[PDB]
């Protein structure tokens, strides 16, 4: 098993992951180091298809220099064919990570949820709104929570339990927050805010009613509970903005 992306050889260890047109490979280099190659099959690509991957690898080309907390794109490339692209490996998806782990250090938490305003805010400060955000978008790469997408190309397919209530009436980066405290209620309490509800049809009726209330059950961290109460408001006007989130005592305090 091997390949080669622009002149330089990589060998294929493993398959990390699987999609439609996409495979993901955990591969070594010539100089014996570790990458992650995304391979995408163009040969059933519509022209509308290759323009949103073209803008996603772009994006992911540019917000590369600003910011550590999204996910390194080494080299890549494209033909009319293929796409390969050399990328950082990461340990685990957070998707994964928390589906393993029972219990989740409160330090562990903060660090995350830290790592994921600063890759969320760099999006945002392109003009760049996810408008889906799951745990398996983010990627634990040392300790170091990293975004993997932006959401612009066409892995929790088809979630409704991050979704929020303006996108169920159908968005702005305040949908982004709405998702981001999802993920962390679910760090919090063991369960997404709607989890209980297994008929979806009922799921996304308790999403946009206001009369539902959202469960926040007391812990030791209030700074914690304040900021899903702050992020879990149904209304986008009402919601904190990822700027406040950054100045917030949970994550700023100590
Ligand atoms: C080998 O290291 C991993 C293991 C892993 O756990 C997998 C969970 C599912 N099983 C079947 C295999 C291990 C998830 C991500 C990684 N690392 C990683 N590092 C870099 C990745 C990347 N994944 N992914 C996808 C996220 C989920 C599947 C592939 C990427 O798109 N890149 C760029």
């Known amino acids: 098993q091997s390949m080669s992306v622009k002149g330089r050889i990589y060998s294929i260890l493993k398959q990390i992951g699987s999609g439609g047109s ?13 990458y992650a190659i995304k391979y995408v099959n163009l040969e059933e690509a519509d022209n509308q298809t290759l323009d949103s991957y073209r803008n996603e690898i772009a994006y992911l080309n540019k917000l ?3 910011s550590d907390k999204i996910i390194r794109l080494y080299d890549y ?13 990461g340990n685990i998806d957070l998707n994964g990570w928390l589906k393993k ?6 330090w562990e938490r903060k660090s995350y949820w830290k790592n994921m305003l600063e890759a969320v805010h760099t999006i945002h400060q392109h003009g760049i709104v996810h408008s889906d955000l799951k745990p398996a978008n983010f990627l634990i790469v040392d300790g170091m929570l990293k975004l993997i997408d932006f959401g612009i190309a066409n892995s929790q397919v088809g979630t409704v339990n ?19 405290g999802c993920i962390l209620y679910y760090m919090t309490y063991g ?13 996304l009726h308790a999403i946009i009613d206001p009369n ?3 469960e926040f059950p007391d812990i030791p961290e209030k700074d914690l509970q ?3 109460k702050c992020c879990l408001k149904r209304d986008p006007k009402q919601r904190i903005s990822i700027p406040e989130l950054l100045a917030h005592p949970y994550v700023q305090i100590q």
């Not at 490339?77 to 490996?89: A, H, K, R």
């Not at 782990?101 to 409160?106: A, E, Q, T």
């Not at 991050?162 to 981001?180: F, G, H, R, T």
């Open 22 to 34: 996409s495979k993901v490979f955990q591969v070594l280099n010539e100089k014996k180091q570790i």
């Open 64 to 66: 590369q220099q600003h």
């Open 226 to 228: 304040d900021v899903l």
């Open 77 to 89: 490339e494209i033909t009319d064919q293929y796409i390969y692209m050399v990328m950082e490996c």
């Open 101 to 106: 782990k029972k219990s989740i250090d409160p």
């Open 212 to 214: 539902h209330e959202i």
């Open 191 to 203: 369960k997404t805010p709607f989890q209980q509800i297994i008929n979806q049809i009922s799921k």
């Open 162 to 180: 991050y979704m929020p209530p303006e996108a169920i009436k159908d968005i702005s980066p305040k949908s982004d927050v709405w998702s981001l």
